[PDB]
Design a protein around this ligand. Structure first.
Ligand SMILES: O=P(O)(O)O[C@H]1[C@H](OP(=O)(O)O)[C@@H](OP(=O)(O)O)[C@H](OP(=O)(O)O)[C@@H](OP(=O)(O)O)[C@H]1OP(=O)(O)O
Length: 175
C-alpha cells in the first residue's frame, strides 16, 4: 500500500500534526539515498533521531487520548452505572443523553484506534523505505519489533475491548 499519498485521507483531521511526519522523514531518507548514490558513506543518525522523536510524540499523544477516553468512561459510569442493563431505570431524556455520550465515546475510541494503526503502518513503511534505498541497511524489522511493537498505540487491544463494551451497551440500549 502507497502510504504517503493515502496519509491525508487516513488522518483524523483534528490530530493531523500529531501523526508521524512521513513527508519530512522521506526527505531524510532521500538525503541518505543520494549520498549512497554518490558512493559516499551515509549518516543515518539524523533520520533515527527524527524517527525516535516522532515515535515519542505519537506514543505520548495516543496515551493522553487513551487516558482521556478512560476518564470519560468513568464519568459515564458515575452517572449511569457500570452495566448497560441499567437503561431500564432511565427515563427517555436520560436514555437519549446516554446514547449521545456513548456514540461520542465510541467515535473517540474508533479515532484513537485508527490513529494507532495508521501510525504503526507509517513506521513500518518508512523503515522499509530506508532499507530499500540505502545499501546494507537492515532496520525495519529490528526497529519495529524493539521500539514500536511495545508501545500502546501499536499493541493496544484494550481500545477494541472497550469498543466491544460500548457497542454492547449501544445494542442493549437500542433493545
Ligand atoms: O505516495 P507518494 O508520495 O507518491 O510516494 C511514492 C511512494 O512512496 P510512499 O508509499 O512511501 O508514500 C512509493 O513507495 P512504494 O510504496 O512504491 O515503496 C515510492 O516509489 P519508488 O520506491 O518506486 O520510488 C516513491 O517514494 P520515493 O520517492 O521515496 O522512492 C514515492 O514517490 P515520490 O516520493 O517520488 O513522489
Amino acid at each position: 500500500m502507497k502510504f504517503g499519498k493515502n496519509l491525508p485521507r487516513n488522518q483524523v483531521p483534528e490530530w493531523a500534526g500529531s501523526y508521524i511526519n512521513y513527508k519530512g522523514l522521506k526527505k531524510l531518507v532521500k538525503a541518505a539515498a543520494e549520498s549512497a548514490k554518490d558512493g559516499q558513506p551515509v549518516d543515518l543518525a539524523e533520520f533515527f533521531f527524527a524517527l525516535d522523536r516522532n515515535l515519542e510524540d505519537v506514543d505520548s499523544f495516543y496515551n493522553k487520548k487513551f487516558a482521556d477516553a478512560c476518564r470519560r468512561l468513568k464519568v459515564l459510569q458515575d452517572r449511569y452505572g457500570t452495566t448497560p442493563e441499567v437503561v431500564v431505570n432511565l427515563d427517555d431524556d436520560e436514555a437519549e443523553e446516554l446514547m449521545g455520550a456513548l456514540l461520542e465515546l465510541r467515535s473517540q475510541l474508533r479515532k484513537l484506534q485508527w490513529f494507532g494503526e495508521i501510525n504503526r503502518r507509517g513506521f513500518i513503511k518508512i523503515t522499509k523505505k530506508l532499507d530499500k534505498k540505502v545499501p546494507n541497511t537492515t532496520t525495519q524489522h529490528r526497529y519495529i519489533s524493539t521500539k514500536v511493537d511495545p508501545k500502546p498505540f501499536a499493541k493496544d487491544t484494550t481500545v477494541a475491548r472497550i469498543l466491544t463494551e460500548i457497542n454492547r451497551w449501544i445494542s442493549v440500549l437500542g433493545d
